[PDB]
Design a protein around this ligand. Structure first.
Ligand SMILES: CCc1c(C(=O)C(N)=O)c2c(OCC(=O)O)cccc2n1Cc1ccccc1
Ligand SMILES: CCc1c(C(=O)C(N)=O)c2c(OCC(=O)O)cccc2n1Cc1ccccc1
Ligand SMILES: CCc1c(C(=O)C(N)=O)c2c(OCC(=O)O)cccc2n1Cc1ccccc1
Lengths: 121, 121
């Protein structure tokens, strides 16, 4: 669910998830996908496409189990779809931390309606 | 949809919706409901309970028709669920504008794990 995603982003990046990523670029936060503005935006683009493949469950509301061992997100879920969901969330949290170096505050509250259309997932 | 909701909030409050309300208190933004911190937070609490009473239409993705006539939000929508959805969004936009006087910047991006569980709607 969005709860576990938010905890993951806070654990990996150390940043408030909705502040730094609630409306970043054309893909982070609300209002679907668009042409990525930068590397951080592409993390959210990939993450949204990760959600679109979850054909057997529901990413926004389905809670899953994960652990924080050796400063690493570990998805211990036995259910295959929840496990696939947890790995989507873990990937974007790692991706967002890995691209903090090119984070641009000018994209933090980006006017998404004027974004160029995105390619199909 | 979030498009209409965001535009309603801007027209009523004069504030940008994601920057000022994308994460406020315990109820504004994603991550569900919680014990509200103030009157602004309670607007989003009531708003989410309003969404729960809807009759099948998707509050996030479904578009509806409304007009800004004589500085008033008018829900001309005729579909019963989309009309109620429009009325939910108009209510929170008015609520946030009515309570701007106690808008506390410290509750912006309020850490959402912080919050106590909310009462049932
Ligand atoms: C980058 C963070 C993010 C999403 C992403 O991880 C992303 N843009 O991919 C995402 C999101 O994406 C899933 C989807 O659109 O279905 C939907 C809604 C909000 C979304 N926040 C903001 C947020 C998440 C969790 C706690 C607090 C704020
Ligand atoms: C689409 C929702 C939205 C914003 C978003 O949700 C978004 N683009 O992120 C946003 C906005 O940005 C959030 C922020 O700056 O706080 C600023 C101002 C208005 C904003 N409307 C309403 C709107 C946008 C474009 C045309 C007509 C109405
Ligand atoms: C108060 C603003 C708000 C929501 C509310 O109005 C609120 N928390 O009640 C809400 C929201 O709530 C509906 C729900 O949780 O299903 C879900 C996701 C984002 C939400 N933004 C932020 C936003 C909305 C529209 C344009 C730009 C930013």
């Amino acid at each position: 669910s969005l709860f576990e995603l938010g905890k993951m982003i806070l654990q990996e990046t150390g940043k408030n998830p909705a502040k730094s990523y609630g409306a970043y670029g054309c893909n982070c936060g609300v209002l679907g996908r668009g042409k990525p503005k930068d590397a951080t935006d592409r993390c959210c683009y990939v993450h949204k496409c990760c959600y679109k493949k979850l054909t057997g469950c529901n990413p926004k509301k389905d809670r899953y189990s994960y652990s924080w061992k050796d400063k690493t997100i570990v998805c211990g879920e036995n259910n295959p779809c929840l496990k696939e969901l947890c790995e989507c969330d873990k990937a974007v949290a790692i991706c967002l931390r890995e691209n903090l170096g090119t984070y641009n505050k000018l994209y933090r509250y980006h006017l998404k309606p004027f974004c160029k259309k995105a390619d199909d997932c």
